[PDB]
Structure formats: C-alpha cells, structure tokens
Amino acid sequence: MEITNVNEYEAIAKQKLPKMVYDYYASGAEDQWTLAENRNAFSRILFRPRILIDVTNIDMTTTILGFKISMPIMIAPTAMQKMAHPEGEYATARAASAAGTIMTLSSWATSSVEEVASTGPGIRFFQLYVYKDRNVVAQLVRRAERAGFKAIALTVDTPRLGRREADIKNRFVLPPFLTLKNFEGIDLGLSSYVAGQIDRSLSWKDVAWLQTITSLPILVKGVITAEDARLAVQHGAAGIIVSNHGARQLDYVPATIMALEEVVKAAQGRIPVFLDGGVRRGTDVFKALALGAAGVFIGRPVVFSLAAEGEAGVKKVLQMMRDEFELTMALSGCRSLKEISRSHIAADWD
Amino acid sequence: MEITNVNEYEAIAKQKLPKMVYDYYASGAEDQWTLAENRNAFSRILFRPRILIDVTNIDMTTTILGFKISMPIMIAPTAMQKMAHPEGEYATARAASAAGTIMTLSSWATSSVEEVASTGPGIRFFQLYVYKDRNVVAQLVRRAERAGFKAIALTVDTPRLGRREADIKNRFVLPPFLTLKNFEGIDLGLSSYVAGQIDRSLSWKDVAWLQTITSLPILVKGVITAEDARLAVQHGAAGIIVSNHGARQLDYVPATIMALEEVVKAAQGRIPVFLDGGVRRGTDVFKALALGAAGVFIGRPVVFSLAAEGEAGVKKVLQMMRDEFELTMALSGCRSLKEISRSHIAADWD
Amino acid sequence: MEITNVNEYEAIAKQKLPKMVYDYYASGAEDQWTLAENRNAFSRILFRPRILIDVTNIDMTTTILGFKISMPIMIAPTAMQKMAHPEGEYATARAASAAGTIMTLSSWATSSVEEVASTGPGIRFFQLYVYKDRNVVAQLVRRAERAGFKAIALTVDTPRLGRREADIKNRFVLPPFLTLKNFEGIDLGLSSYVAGQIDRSLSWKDVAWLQTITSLPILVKGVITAEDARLAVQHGAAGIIVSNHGARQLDYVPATIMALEEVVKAAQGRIPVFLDGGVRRGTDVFKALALGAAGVFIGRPVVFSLAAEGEAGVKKVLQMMRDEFELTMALSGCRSLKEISRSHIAADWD
Amino acid sequence: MEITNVNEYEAIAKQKLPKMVYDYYASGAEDQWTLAENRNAFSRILFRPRILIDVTNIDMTTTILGFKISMPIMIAPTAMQKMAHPEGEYATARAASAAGTIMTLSSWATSSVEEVASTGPGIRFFQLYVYKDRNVVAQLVRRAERAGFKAIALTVDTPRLGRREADIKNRFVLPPFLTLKNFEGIDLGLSSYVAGQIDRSLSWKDVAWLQTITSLPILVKGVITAEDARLAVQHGAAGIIVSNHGARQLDYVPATIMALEEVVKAAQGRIPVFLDGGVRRGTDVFKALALGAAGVFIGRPVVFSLAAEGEAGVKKVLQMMRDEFELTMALSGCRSLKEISRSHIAADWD
Ligand SMILES: Cc1cc2nc3c(=O)[nH]c(=O)nc-3n(C[C@@H](O)[C@H](O)[C@@H](O)COP(=O)(O)O)c2cc1C
Ligand SMILES: Cc1cc2nc3c(=O)[nH]c(=O)nc-3n(C[C@@H](O)[C@H](O)[C@@H](O)COP(=O)(O)O)c2cc1C
Ligand SMILES: Cc1cc2nc3c(=O)[nH]c(=O)nc-3n(C[C@@H](O)[C@H](O)[C@@H](O)COP(=O)(O)O)c2cc1C
Ligand SMILES: Cc1cc2nc3c(=O)[nH]c(=O)nc-3n(C[C@@H](O)[C@H](O)[C@@H](O)COP(=O)(O)O)c2cc1C
Ligand SMILES: CCCCCC(CCCCC)Sc1[nH]nnc1C(=O)O
Ligand SMILES: CCCCCC(CCCCC)Sc1[nH]nnc1C(=O)O
Ligand SMILES: CCCCCC(CCCCC)Sc1[nH]nnc1C(=O)O
Ligand SMILES: CCCCCC(CCCCC)Sc1[nH]nnc1C(=O)O
C-alpha cells in the first residue's frame, strides 16, 4: 500500500476532515455537472506518441513572465488553507519554493502576504478581486509588492457567488481561530464584510484602473470564450487563465480543457494562456500544453494533500505530477516543452 | 439540512403521498424514455458566459400577451391538486399571484374557476379540451371569462390518453371527497364521463370554432413539429406551447428543449413560443429563453412542493427558481431578458 | 398489479421454467451484444407526431401476399414450443387465428403441420431449411401444402449454429416426451440427425431448386445487407425478412431496425420487406413500418407468454401489441397504415 | 458448467494466483483507460455477413514471413511465465507447436531459448530490447539463431517503464526460485540490472545496427502512428506490429483496433502489419484481418489459462479461438483469409 496518484489524497482528506470543511473544498456548483466534466473531458483526448527518439534527458523548465521555473505546474489560489492543516499557506509556500515553482496566494488566505514571504524566497503571484472599497484594493496591492509578489491575478468570474448547495445545507462558517490575515492590518466579522465587499459593477474599465495603481503584470482568471479573450488582450492583460473556477460558479460551462483551444486561438500568441480545473495527472498536463497552454495550475489537490500530510503531502503531490509529466514526455518522444505539439495529441472533436 | 433545489421536493412528496397519488403525478408514458430525456437533454447544452459586465441590477420582468409579470416562469395546468394537499389549487393560486406570475388552471381541477378567482387578483389562464358536448365547452369558456381569466390554453396532444402503466397496475381512482368542480354547476361519476367526453375527431376547424365563441387569445399546447407550428400560426393561434405533456402521452417524442428551436423558427416571430417539461433549474430557464422561448411553464414541481409544504412549498419553488435564474443571468452577463442570446449558449447539436 | 407490457412475461417465464429451457429461449450468441442492441436500437428513433387530426377510426388491416390480416404483427417461427407449455404450438396456433393474423411454423416444432392445421382455419407459413437429404425437404414441402400452408419461409442465416454459451454450459437436451413431429412420419435421436442434416453448401442455385418443387411464395429469412437483398430479388424471392435470428447466430451484426432501411432501398419496392428481432412495443411496430417494413414478426414474446399463461398469454401478448400500435398511430395522426411515413419518424442517424 | 470463452480464464487465474502475480499480469497503466478501451473498441465494429455461400470448407492457413501456419492467431511475448505455472514457457511452447502456430519468446522468460527449443520443433520468434550493453544484445541474438528462432521482434515502446500502480502498491518482486534464464550464461539480481540496462537513447540508427549483427527479419513492435509506420518501412523493417503494449505503457493511447487502419495504409502493402491487445474472440480476429492485419497476437490469455490449467489451458485457449474464428468466417461467407474484406465489416467511424 502506498499513495501512487494525486486523486487518492481526496479520499484521505475526506476521511479525516469535518464534513463542512471537506464539502467546502470538494463541492461544485449546484448539480455539479461541470465538476465531473472537468475530469472526464481529459478522457476524450488521446495520444499519438513518437517512438525511437533519444529521450535520455527531458527538459521541463519553462519561462513564465520572465521567471524561469522547474516545471509548467503551478499552484492555484485556494482559500482558508489553515482549515486543512494548522500550517496551511505556510506548508504550501515552502513546498512550492522547494518544488521550484510558482504559488498564487489568495486574498482570503488564513496567512498574510508577508507571513508567506518569510517562509523563504520564491516566485509568487497574488490573487485579488476589485472590491467596492477601491482603497482596500490599493492597500492589498501595495502590501503584495512589498512582500515581493511578482504578479496580480485578477479573478473575473465571481461577480456573485455560485450556489454550492452542500455549504448551504451545512451552514458553512469559518472556524473560531482562523482569520483572513491580509485584511487584518490595513484600513477597512471578516468573513461577512469581505463577502459583502464584492463589487458586481466591474467592467473592462476597472481593469484599466488596476493598471494605474500597480505596474505588476495583470493575469485575468476566469476567461472561457474567444470574445472575452480578445478583450483581455486589448485591455493590456499580461496573460489569460482559462478557468471555470473549479466548477464552483456557473454550472454547465464547458470543461476548461475543451474551451482552451478557442481561447488560445483568440489570443493569437500575443500573451500566454494558462489553464486550471481538473488537472490531476501528468497526462493531463501534456494535453493542456499540446493544446496551446503555457502552463497549468492546480487547486483542490493542494488542500487535500495538505489535510492528509501537511507540507509532505503537498511536496508529494508536486513530485508525483512532475514525474508523471516527465514519463509522458518521454513516452511521447518530447525532450523539451518546445517539442510538444498539437500532432502529438488527438481530440474527440477533431 | 435544508431544501436547496426544486427536485428535492419529489423525494418528500414520494415519502408522504400514497403510492397511487405519487405514481399518478410522477409517471411518464410506458417505458418512460422521454420522461428521463426531458431532464437529461438540458445537460447537453452549455454556457458561453460573458465576464466583466455590470450586473448590478438584473431585470427578469417580461410582457406575456400584454400582461407584465415578475419573471418568465409560469405555472402549467396540472390536475386534481387537492390530492396533494387539502388546499390544492387555492395554495397554488395564492402562491402564483404573490410570486407575481401567471397560473394556468386545469379544467379537471378540484376547485372551480370562481373558487380560484376569490383567492385574490392575479393573471390566470384556463386550460381546456374541446369535448364532444360543445355546449359544455361553451359553458366552461363563459364561466372562465366571468372569473376574469385572461386566456384559453387549448391542449391538442391528448386525442386519446397515453398508457401510464403505474396507474393501470395501481387501478387509479379519484379519492372520495374530491370533485372536478368546474363540471359541477353547469349542464352536462365526474371522472368517468369527462374522460369519456374526449372528442378524438378534433382538427384545425375546431380551433376556428373555439375562436367564434370566445375573444380570448387561444394558446395551442402540445405542438412539437415545425409543420404544426405553421398551421397553428395560420389558424389564428395567439401563441404556441412546445410541450410533450410531461412525457405522459406518446413515448419517444423528443425532449421539449430539443424540439423548441424547430418550432421557434417555424413561428417566424409572428407569435410567442413557450415551453414546458423538465424545467427544474434557473439554468434550464436561461437555456429555453436563449433558444427562443418567451417563457416557460412548470408542472410536477408544483404538486410535489404542494404535498410537502402546501402553499409555502409552492412559494419556495417559485423563489428558488427565480433566484437561480437571476444568478444565471448575472454570471452570463445579461442584465435583462432582451440581453439573452443564442450566442450565450452552445448546444451539443451545434 | 397486472401485466401491462409484453416484456414482463420474460420475468414470469424465467421464474417458472427450468434454467435450461429459459436459457435456451432467452440467450443470444456469445457475448450477446446484438441481443441487447436489438432492443436498444429502437430507443434511437424518435417520433414527429401530427396533432389535430381526426383519429376516430384507426385501420390496421394490411394485405400480405394477397392475404388480408387484422394487423401488421405476425408470429415468427420459434422451436420446440411444447417445452414452454404442454399445448405449445396448439395454443399459439389458436391464438394467432383468433387474433386474425399469420403464424409461421418451424420445421423443428413439437407438433406437426397437420396437428396445427386441425386447430382451426388460419393463414399460416412454414419455415424450413434445405437439408442434405433434399428428399426430406420435398416431403416437408408437400406435407405443408396439404395442410394448407400459404408460403415457405426459407431461413438462410444458419449454415452453422451460433455459439449460445449458456446452452453449452447447461448441456441442453430435448426433454423425454417431446418430438420433432414434422420429421415423424416421412422417410428419413431426431435432435441429433436433423441437427446433423444441416447443409452448409447452400447457395443461390438451391433457392432456384426449391422453386422447382413448390409453387408457394418463398420468403428469404436472414438478409441484412443490400447486396444480398438484390440477389434475393433477382432469384425470385417473394419477400425478404430482415432478421439476425434474434441475435443467436453471429454476434456484432447490427440491430435489425438499423439495417432495415438499407434492405428496403435495395428491394426498390419490387417485393415486401419484413423485420423481426427486438419488437416488444407498438412504438417498435410504428418505427419499423415508418422505415419501410410491410409488417413485423415476434419470437421470444410468444414462448415467454406461453410458459406463463399458455394460450391466454399469447392472446394477451397479441392484444397488448395491437392496442399499443393503435394508440401510437392515433397519437401520430395516422388513420391507416398507408398514412405512416418516414417524416413521422426521426432517426439518430439522420 | 464448462469454459466456453477465453475471458473466463482471467477469473480462475485471479482466484488462484497471489494478488501480486495476478495484478502484475492483469494491470494496465495508471488509470487503465486504454486497458478497458482495448476490449471495448471491438464492440464499435459491426459485421455485414454474406448469406447463401458454400461454406463447407474453411481455410484459415496463412503464410507469415514465408512460414505457413494453421491460423492467423499467434502468441505474444509475455514474461516470467513460470510465475503462472511451474512449466511456464515449456507448456506454452508445446501448446503453440501443437496448435500449428508461432510463439514469440520474451528475453525476460523464466526459461531459455534453448530450453524452449528442446520441447520440440516449431516456428518461433524472439522478442528483445536493445540494451545499453550492445554486447549482451549480440550474444542474445546469436543464441536465438542457434536455437533456430526465425525472427527478431524488436519492442520500441518501452524507453522507460509505464506506471502500473498496482505493482507499486504491491511492491512486486520476482519469486525466489525463478530466473531470467536467457541472461544466465553469457557475459554480462537479474531483475534489477536487466531493468537498469534499458537504453533510452535508442533511435532509428540503432535499428540499422541490429540489422548489421543479424540477418533475421526484424519486426518492430509498438508502432501506432502512420508517421512511425513509414519510418519503420524506410529502415528495413520486415513487418510492423501495431501494439500499445497491452495498455501498460502510456495511458490514453488509442485501442490498437482503432489505430490499425492508419498503420496499414501507411505501410502501403510493402510489409505485413500485425496487431495485438484486447484480442479475446474469433470475432475480434475477423475484424482485425478485415481491417488489413496479416495476423494477430495474444498475451494475457496465455498466462491466465496457464495458471488455471497449465498446457491444457493454453491448448484450450488456442482451440476456442480458432473455432470461434472459423465459425465467424463461415457465417460471414468467407472460405479463406483472402476472402475477408473491408466490406464485410462496418466501423463506427465509417
Ligand atoms: C476550496 C477552493 C477555494 C478556492 N478559492 C479560490 C480563491 O481564493 N480565488 C480564486 O480566484 N479561485 C479560487 N478557487 C478556484 C481556483 O483556485 C482554481 O480555479 C482551482 O480550484 C482549479 O481547479 P481544481 O481544483 O480542479 O484544480 C477555489 C477553489 C477551491 C476548491
Ligand atoms: C399530474 C399531472 C397532471 C397534468 N394535468 C394536465 C392537465 O390538466 N392539462 C394539460 O394540458 N396538461 C397536463 N399535464 C401536463 C402539463 O401540465 C405540463 O405539460 C407539465 O406537466 C410540464 O412538465 P413538467 O411536469 O416536467 O414540468 C399534467 C402533468 C402532470 C404531471
Ligand atoms: C427459442 C427460439 C427458437 C428459434 N427458432 C427458430 C426457428 O425454428 N426457425 C427460424 O428460422 N428462426 C428461429 N428463431 C429466431 C426467429 O424465429 C426470429 O428471428 C425471432 O426470434 C425474432 O426475434 P425476437 O425473439 O427478438 O422477437 C428462434 C428464436 C428463438 C428465441
Ligand atoms: C504480463 C505481461 C508481460 C508482458 N511482457 C512483454 C514482454 O516481455 N515483451 C514485450 O514486448 N511485450 C510484453 N507485454 C505485452 C505484449 O506481449 C503484448 O503486446 C500483449 O500483452 C497483447 O495484449 P493482450 O494482453 O491484450 O493480449 C506483456 C504483457 C503482459 C500482460
Ligand atoms: C470576494 C469573493 C468572495 C469569495 C471568497 C470565498 C467564497 C465564499 C466563502 C465561504 C462561504 S473563498 C473563494 N475565493 N474565491 N473563490 C472562492 C471559492 O470558495 O470558490
Ligand atoms: C379530457 C382529457 C382527460 C385527461 C384528464 C386526466 C387524465 C386521466 C385521469 C386519471 C385516470 S388528468 C390530466 N389532464 N390532462 N392531462 C392529464 C394527465 O394526468 O396527464
Ligand atoms: C437445421 C438447423 C438447426 C437449428 C434448430 C434448433 C437449434 C439447436 C437446437 C438445440 C441445441 S432450434 C432453431 N431453429 N432455428 N433456429 C433455432 C434456434 O434455437 O435459434
Ligand atoms: C528492458 C525492459 C524491462 C521490461 C521487462 C519487465 C517489466 C518490469 C518487471 C517487473 C517490475 S516484464 C515485460 N517485458 N516487456 N514488457 C513487460 C511488461 O511487464 O509489461
């Protein structure tokens, strides 16, 4: 017996976390169709491996926004990680740096940007929502810059929260001793106002506004149509992240893997297009990249592994994924990321 | 624990109603393929949401036949509602008016048009079948007009009853104290003659006949082919209701959501086209409207909620649906019904 | 509780017949894929009903080979019916005549042509295989003609028996007191030689040979490709029966309903094309006819009903089917068989 | 009760072999999608049988690389067969010769080429991997030639081992008394070095190298794209074996039956194209040949039958398959292999 794949962590997490906590991390929106589809869609893409190629040395390094990382597998911003393990964001922070990759911190983290920054050096991104109190947004950005965060990931798919029914039936509440640390300290319990601070009037001009208060590259997270992808480009986006929020917002939106190519083509190679949602295997990673993605982000796997084995769990998840990805490149006949091509894959919609 | 979706009422209704009553409301025709398909088909239509749009104020109001209602979700005519709850049609009547929407009364109701009318003011439609005794039909129409009913919904898909096997095995009978109140009073137990009064010789000329005894707009309920949709238009129909009778008539007829577009195109915008059957979620509502429907009607959800919590249940069903529909519009980037478009959706048959 | 559909007889038959007998009647070839598919394929064809049509009088009568019958539902030749009920072929014979339809007798019947003929008057067909001993074939034909059988149905899909594994595991044997009565009497235990009498050298010239020893119309049973359908026409076939032997021969042959249209088109209206296999509902009957079939034949339903209720069971099966077929015509808007059209149906392959 | 099909051996093997051994033989790569698909794909190809054809004598003999064999069903190289039964490769060797067919020996066999050769005369192929120690490869080839092996089957789909998770959880190890006999004797425990001897720098020039140390025909095993098929032809391959290694390498590669035609067309009839993976029925064999394959190879069925009944089991598997294949040819109207055609089949992708 031994953990051999990322998905097995979900079971352990489930068996140890309180229903409320597990359900919060595991649930999708309403009937959870897209949740299931995010995983199932990958099963509709097949390989066309090239044999008899010198695959002695496999290079998985890539350059994201000028930064060079070990692999094209980064960590997505989850939220309230300390509900999964006392160390929460700390464990995830150290694990990301050690793995040689990027970690995106959530504004709703149970640790502050500076708390995370102290763990050690590493390339980090900050996820944020343009709240009603623009002054609070300015403060958060300024605070992230000081902590040395390299970019801002603006999430544009939550003008209003999706209906994750399990949470409603459970009557979800943030446990007693946890706190949204990034909101502790600057000029404004914390769970209700921050939730009530969501500004639903946001439009493309607010994207411009963000650009006038920070020089950090802005990544739009939550684009799934070619129409918005073009607008994101026109409005100075540094990159686009094809995401359906882990299927927790609007159910019946396609699987990110299916929508990806449409977004990649819309971008016309002007800016990097990334993807998240459903990634659990190295084979998943190879397909996303063969379809045009510059890299991918993982969410749930982090919190599940964190609950099961803390930092070791997160390190284990990152190692398994890079190993699987390497072996996939090897068996496909690709020695570097640049060698992966659309012809190495075959989609059910081809 | 708490009710978070319309479908959950069916379980409660089932656990409390007598087999005979539940089966009568729940069953489809014969092998019940279309019953299952009415729900499953919606799962084959996906969204293409627009992000970064000011979705501060969402307008769900619409004008149906000159009447302005709160939402495009109306109640379909069921039958013998008092089998589900002592108040039956009364509870449904008050709930519809309070919700600010239209309620279609069935000729086989366990309450009379005037009984319903007394609950309070509200826009109501009357469902009827051209019986052999045309004189009884005239009386019913005249009686509905006095009660202030705004339109007549003529059902044309039941020349003969479908075979709902559960009813046959159960030997379905109307409970002792209930009565088809609309037939009580005018010139003609009630379950057998009214069932034997079905006129199967009806053709388009009888539609004309109805038009010579009433000035109320006539809605044809039960059209699912483009051929009949055109005829309905030619024969002065005020609107068409794409319906397969909740899959209780001819099994193997397509899901209303699949047939809808064909009917919408046939109508050429000359008259409103509505839909019913399988609607259980706000996402269902958005798809029907994105496909051309002017509004939708719900059947079973009413009787199930009625059995579970009487009027409160019906109010709960209507609130949940409008809430879900609103959040869907918000996440899709639509501020009014006029903003919903075919491009906001993606069908498996595209 | 009450029997409401043909398929329910299989359960009763199963619960009362010995494993060996049930398995013999119920099994398909090897992995039984086509068995399942014969039924499932019908689920891939939908209706396009016409409403508001005078459906007061429905005419199901048809003329098959000059003979006028009550409905386009005939009985297929099964075998050793007395294993299902003491009366076997007798009950089936009386039931067919009473129902006003045709019954095809198998050469392997546990009753002789003359035994069946004595039950009463009725239009009957005789199924036969060109055995090695052509003299035995001549005798069988002559014997059928005397008994007043109207046509010969030559089965061309069994040059060698398919592998019905259940029979092998069960070590199937004909019960002690039963006998292949048609072979008793003329010039040649009976189970082994008759099985060993199968001539696998048969080709189109042998079809011609049959035509020189009888003037009765010859129906080829077991044609499923357009290539053979044309040959059947060229070689004086009186009609073609699209059949896959109830999926008991070569597994992975398409469902008869799927292959039908190809055969109908090949025939070019020169001769009637019939179908069998999987027919269990009136909706099944309407689809087969809408696709071009002149009528259909049923197999297993006869033996299952026979085991459950003897003749009454068979009468019940025939009544249920005509009732279901009538109601389907009524709901589709078809007053006669001639009114059924391809446009009243919609196939998944359209 | 009695064994009626090849697949039933897996159950017996499972119920008697130790988890570790069964899992090693039965498992696929990671989530085992292609494992399931290798079998399921055959279900998507249907027959178009020709009736009324003289199928008295069926000829299944074929000429592979100049050698004439009884049937187009050969044995694929498995590995460590003695884990399944004390006799291992011996039983398989005698069974293959008796069946009148070819057996491919694995370099990792628990019996040596000469040990196998002593069982008796028979046409045999040797499977091999170009190890780092080219000198060991030369020795193996020379050793095979002496034992009278007719050809070398070079496997090109394992530059690195796939992740068969069950083995990892089980901590698979070669039982105490077994030995990789081909490595015992010549100039180089055995499980770890031989596994560490895999050369992952192999490319097409190494294929040429093999051709300069042996005159035996070289068969490339593991080609699944048309691109590699052409290269295999250009580089003097004697034949191509479309294989996905029994789905144990890279998951999400298509089923061999689906990829086959692409490879057949690429070869342009210049060299024979074979197939393996998922073959379990004679119907499977007919489809592979109708698609262009010159013959097929079976893997798992050998080890499962071996575990259940030793040599008798293997003889039983080979007999069942030829019987099933014969009956399929008979029912399709094919008297010889040359008579099987693409028109006798119908693929879901046609
Ligand atoms: C428990 C949880 C919390 C999340 N929190 C955020 C968040 O703080 N910010 C954000 O933009 N997205 C959030 N997401 C979603 C993204 O981080 C991301 O798209 C991700 O969940 C990707 O899909 P995966 O979980 O299938 O890997 C959250 C997802 C989960 C499951
Ligand atoms: C118990 C029950 C009674 C019905 N009674 C009527 C009726 O009186 N008149 C009519 O035209 N349709 C009747 N229908 C069907 C329609 O009201 C309507 O098409 C509806 O059931 C829509 O589908 P849904 O139940 O899936 O929402 C009935 C349906 C049910 C389940
Ligand atoms: C038990 C049994 C016996 C059969 N016997 C014969 C027979 O004697 N002659 C023949 O041509 N076909 C025979 N068939 C098949 C046909 O009668 C016929 O194609 C039929 O089974 C149609 O399919 P169904 O069973 O799905 O209705 C037999 C089928 C069964 C199940
Ligand atoms: C237990 C086992 C051992 C295998 N050993 C080898 C081997 O030694 N050499 C090789 O090239 N392929 C090996 N394969 C795979 C091939 O022999 C072959 O492609 C085969 O398994 C075909 O598929 P099937 O098992 O579905 O019939 C092995 C497969 C199994 C299941
Ligand atoms: C300003 C937007 C508010 C969202 C923040 C939280 C969602 C609701 C918290 C529990 C009720 S946690 C989170 N952040 N972003 N998405 C989520 C997620 O849980 O899916
Ligand atoms: C004049 C037509 C007669 C139909 C009225 C009833 C159907 C049968 C009543 C129980 C046997 S109730 C009803 N009304 N319309 N459809 C139904 C339905 O139950 O599906
Ligand atoms: C001359 C051909 C021999 C077939 C006759 C019988 C089949 C085998 C009898 C039980 C072993 S009964 C029968 N007749 N035709 N098909 C069948 C069937 O059982 O599918
Ligand atoms: C030089 C390549 C090494 C592969 C040989 C073995 C695979 C691993 C042995 C158990 C850990 S047995 C084998 N040989 N080829 N494929 C396999 C298989 O088991 O799938």
Contact of B296 with B316, CB cutoff 8 Å: no
**Distances, alpha carbon D57 to alpha carbons C228, D18, D342, in Å:** 21, 44, 22
- Looking at residue B179, its amino acid is T
What is the distance between the alpha carbons of residues D175 and A223, in angstroms, rounded to a whole number?
55
Helices (H), chain C: 8-16, 19-26, 33-40, 89-99, 113-118, 134-146, 165-170, 190-196, 204-211, 226-234, 256-267, 282-290, 300-332
Residue C46, strand partner residues = C346
What is the distance between the alpha carbons of residues C105 and C124, in angstroms, rounded to a whole number?
7
- Looking at residue C269, its amino acid is G
Q: Establish if B331 touches chain A: CB-CB under 8 angstroms.
A: yes
Q: Record the resolution, in angstroms.
A: 2.6
Distance from CA of B30 to the nearest CA of C (A): 8
Task: Report CA torsion sign: C63, C65, C71, C72.
Answer: negative
Ligand 5 site, CB within 6 A: A 79, 106, 108, 129, 158, 161, 167, 172, 195, 198, 248
- The rounded Cα D92 to chain-centroid distance in angstroms is 13
Pairing between strand C45-47 and C345-347?
A: antiparallel
Contact of C42 with C296, CB cutoff 8 Å: no
CB contact under 8 A, B50 and A227: yes
Q: Which residue has the tokens 């094919």?
A: D334
Closest CA to A206 of A145, A127, A141, A129: A129
For chain D, the distance separating the N- and C-terminal CA atoms, rounded to the nearest angstrom, is 40
What is the distance between the alpha carbons of residues A151 and A103, in angstroms, rounded to a whole number?
11
Closest CA to D329 of D314, D311, D341, D315: D341
Half-sphere exposure of B323 toward its Cβ, with a 13 Å CA cutoff? 13
CB contact under 8 A, B30 and C332: no
What is the Cα Rg of chain B in Å?
Answer: 19
Task: Report CA torsion sign: B288, B289, B295, B301.
Answer: positive
The topology under which CATH files domain B1-350 is TIM Barrel (3.20.20)
Q: Vertex B16, ends B12 and B20: CA angle to 5°?
A: 115
Enumerate residues 6+ apart whose C-beta is below 8 A from A98: A315
Q: Using DSSP, how many helices (H) and how many strands (E) does chain A show?
A: 13, 12
For D245, phi and psi rounded to 5 degrees?
A: 60, 30
Contact of A143 with A184, CB cutoff 8 Å: no
Contact of C295 with C62, CB cutoff 8 Å: yes
Closest ligand 3 atom to the C-alpha of C153? Answer: 11
Q: Extract the tokens encoding D39.
A: 């079998």
Chain A hits for D169, Cβ within 8 Å: 1-2, 4
Contact of B55 with B278, CB cutoff 8 Å: no
Residue from the list D5, D53, D346 with its beta carbon closest to the beta carbon of C165: D5
Q: Extract the tokens encoding A117.
A: 């920054």
Half-sphere exposure of B174 toward its Cβ, with a 13 Å CA cutoff? 18
What is the Cα Rg of chain D in Å?
Answer: 19
What is residue C255's DSSP assignment?
P
Q: Which residue has the tokens 């949204």?
A: A180
Pairing between strand C62-64 and C67-69?
A: antiparallel
Q: Vertex A292, ends A291 and A295: CA angle to 5°?
A: 110
What is the distance between the alpha carbons of residues C73 and B282, in angstroms, rounded to a whole number?
46
Nearest residue on chain C to D48, judged by CA atoms?
Answer: C225
Task: Report CA torsion sign: D59, D62, D67, D72.
Answer: negative
C155 lines ligand 3 (CB under 6 A): yes
Residue from the list A156, A160, A203 with its beta carbon closest to the beta carbon of B54: A203
Active-site residue B85, yes or no? no
Closest CA to A350 of D89, D254, D20: D254
C298 lines ligand 3 (CB under 6 A): yes
What is the distance between the alpha carbons of residues B42 and B346, in angstroms, rounded to a whole number?
11
Contact of A88 with A305, CB cutoff 8 Å: no
Structure determination technique employed:
X-ray
Contacts 24+ apart (CB under 8 A), D103-108: D103/D74, D103/D75, D104/D74, D104/D75, D104/D76, D104/D77, D104/D153, D104/D297, D105/D77, D105/D149, D106/D77, D106/D78, D106/D79, D107/D140, D107/D180, D107/D182, D107/D183, D108/D79, D108/D80, D108/D180, D108/D182, D108/D194
The verdict on whether residue B128 carries a ligand-binding annotation is: yes
CB atoms inside a 10 Å sphere around CB C169: 15
Q: Establish if B106 touches chain A: CB-CB under 8 angstroms.
A: no
Residue of C78, C107, C131, C314 to test ligand 3 pocket, by largest number of atoms within 8 Å of CB: C78
Which residue's CA is the closest to the ligand 3 atom numbered 19?
C245
CB contact under 8 A, B224 and C43: no
Helices (H), chain D: 8-16, 19-26, 33-40, 89-99, 113-118, 134-146, 165-170, 190-196, 204-211, 226-234, 256-267, 282-290, 300-332
Closest CA to D214 of D99, D137, D282, D314: D137
What is the distance between the alpha carbons of residues B62 and B294, in angstroms, rounded to a whole number?
8
Enumerate residues 6+ apart whose C-beta is below 8 A from D338: none
What is the distance between the alpha carbons of residues D188 and A200, in angstroms, rounded to a whole number?
72
Q: Extract the tokens encoding B315.
A: 């109010």
- Looking at residue B135, its amino acid is N
Enumerate residues 6+ apart whose C-beta is below 8 A from A334: A55, A58, A340, A344
Enumerate residues 6+ apart whose C-beta is below 8 A from A47: A283, A286, A332, A344, A345, A346, D250, D252, D253, D254
What is the distance between the alpha carbons of residues B58 and B50, in angstroms, rounded to a whole number?
15
**Distances, alpha carbon C23 to alpha carbons A55, A133, C13, C19, C26, in Å:** 56, 75, 11, 6, 5
Pairing between strand A67-69 and A73-75?
A: unpaired
Closest CA to B250 of C331, C286, C322, C326: C331
Q: Which residue has the tokens 């009413």?
A: B302
Q: Establish if D320 touches chain A: CB-CB under 8 angstroms.
A: no
Burial category of B192 from C-beta neighbours within 10 Å (exposed 0-12, middle 13-18, buried 19 and up)? exposed
A85, A235, A245, A344: which is the annotated catalytic residue?
Answer: A245
For chain B, the distance separating the N- and C-terminal CA atoms, rounded to the nearest angstrom, is 40
Closest CA to A272 of A148, A125, A79: A125
Q: Extract the tokens encoding A168.
A: 């409603």
What is the distance between the alpha carbons of residues A291 and C21, in angstroms, rounded to a whole number?
57
Task: Report CA torsion sign: D45, D46, D48, D53.
Answer: positive
- Looking at residue A177, its amino acid is F
Q: Vertex A32, ends A29 and A38: CA angle to 5°?
A: 105
Residue from the list B33, B160, B207 with its beta carbon closest to the beta carbon of C327: B160
Q: Extract the tokens encoding D31.
A: 């989530």
- Three-state secondary structure call for residue A273: strand
User: Can you list the positions of beta strands (E) in A101-186?
Assistant: 103-105, 124-128, 151-155
**Distances, alpha carbon D12 to alpha carbons B159, C165, D308, in Å:** 59, 18, 6
Q: Establish if B253 touches chain C: CB-CB under 8 angstroms.
A: yes
Q: Extract the tokens encoding D3.
A: 């064994």
Which residue's CA is the closest to the ligand 5 atom numbered 3?
A195
Q: Establish if B30 touches chain C: CB-CB under 8 angstroms.
A: yes
Q: Which of B252, B258, B260, B262 to mutate to test the interface with C (most CBs of C within 10 A)?
A: B252
Nearest residue on chain C to B223, judged by CA atoms?
Answer: C51
Q: Extract the tokens encoding D208.
A: 């040429």
What is the distance between the alpha carbons of residues C35 and A275, in angstroms, rounded to a whole number?
44
Axis crossing angle, helix C19-26 with helix C8-16, rounded to the nearest 10? 150
The verdict on whether residue D164 carries a ligand-binding annotation is: yes
CB atoms inside a 10 Å sphere around CB C18: 11
Q: Using DSSP, how many helices (H) and how many strands (E) does chain D show?
A: 13, 12
- Three-state secondary structure call for residue D97: helix
- Looking at residue D237, its amino acid is A
Q: Establish if B262 touches chain C: CB-CB under 8 angstroms.
A: no
Length of chain D: 350
Residue from the list A203, A224, A250 with its beta carbon closest to the beta carbon of B328: A250
Contact of D101 with D74, CB cutoff 8 Å: yes
What is the distance between the alpha carbons of residues A147 and A219, in angstroms, rounded to a whole number?
18
